[PDB]
Point group: C6
Chain length 102, copies 6
């Protein structure tokens, strides 16, 4: 848990899909000198807390227990027309004062 270059800071870019970054988690997990028990624990636990709020909001929202594959399906929505069209459509409609935050 938190091996050199692997968990202490592996981080998904704001424009970096969950795809490359998660792989950065897998391949770097291969690149670290971790025990088996060491990597499996790293994956579930850190992968979420450190990855791009677009998807981090999806890892937590899916609700824990979501199969990794499902995290991928959900994070695949990360993206412009899919995830951004909603974050731009939503954030803009809250400031449209039927529901603006004061």
């Amino acid at each position: 848990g938190g091996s050199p270059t692997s968990i202490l800071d592996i981080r998904q870019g704001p424009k970096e899909p969950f795809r490359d970054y998660v792989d950065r988690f897998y391949k770097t997990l291969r690149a670290e000198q971790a025990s088996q028990e060491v990597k499996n624990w790293m994956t579930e636990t850190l992968l979420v807390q450190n990855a791009n709020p677009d998807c981090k909001t999806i890892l937590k929202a899916l609700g824990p227990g979501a199969t990794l594959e499902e995290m991928m399906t959900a994070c695949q929505g990360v993206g412009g027309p899919g995830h951004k069209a909603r974050v731009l459509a939503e954030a803009m409609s809250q400031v449209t004062n039927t529901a603006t935050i004061m």
Copy 2:
């Protein structure tokens, strides 16, 4: 699916079009050591399911039976002027006047 690399997850990014990714689906199959029955099965089932929600929403809109050409013509507009044109407006114009979601 599940064959090595080719069809476990072959994914379509948000900016990667349905066009370029098709090759990712097929050309990557050229790499898996799978029977033709194994591959053609993959071309259909794993394609629509693990590829780009802008397009998937179109693969299930066109629906099954759509030749790849049908999934091609419609998903061609995936992108800003074609799809984002219809995507920004759908969420923006919905939540604002009548489709406001509480």
Copy 3:
């Protein structure tokens, strides 16, 4: 009909303009092993049909019979100016005030 790499997939992108793709048409046709007329036939039937809804919506707009020299001229602002510009301001104003679709 499309011989290998010729008219089966010569497809334009959603970010790629009629300038780059049009070249793909002719060039990849040089790599095809087809009859002379096949190439001339290929352009009229496939090009307009399997090419990027930006240039495709322009092409129909041109009205068939517009020389390739003319299609080039027409689809030049494809890409951010001609096309992506006109497109955002329209969808935004059609669905919103009068052309609102229920």
Copy 4:
């Protein structure tokens, strides 16, 4: 006239600035086997006809006969911040309140 690659298709892309294309007009022409007068005619004539609507229309704003430098001074804004802060950025608010086009 236009010898192969020189003036028949030297064109400025859509996202492309007058900078990169002007370099092309100035690059490909060297590759042309034209007469000294012909080339002089080529810049003033073909540079404006086939140079990017962001910046082309600019050449119309400056207007014909302007010094090439001025063509650059006014076509420097083409591209994300300068040109676009002004054109569609305005079109968003034009078609909306007073400039609504039926």
Copy 5:
């Protein structure tokens, strides 16, 4: 302090996440011949000063006293889909309804 290529200008892009830039910051902080205190000192004071105003405002916002990790985690939310979603939502309506600036 401030050695060549190290801190005299080590600067992050407008969009560059604090990570890519920092891969520079750290790598070059290690390449300059600075005393253990000189470098360490630089990693504190300069890291916040010469870095992408998006992330810089975040840095100040977290407030000093937060672990370095927090400085970059917060800046990991710098952004296209995430940070920009929040900023775009607010700026547009700030000026429009209450925060109108004359």
Copy 6:
């Protein structure tokens, strides 16, 4: 000034930040066969004139006489989130209600 490639056309792109271009300005100067004074004159007079309107509107605003460090800091915001958030947000809200230009 006016030596080949150095100050006649050294230009900042539209998406290119004040950093990359300034670098073109400084590096290209090394290429010109100018007197030491000649280059100094060149950095002040031209750097502000043929450099990307975002930063150019900033350079004038800072006010001449500002150190290169001052042009650098102020123009670091050139870019999307920092400079575009403000430009679009303003133009959009100026044209709309009170600052509508006839």
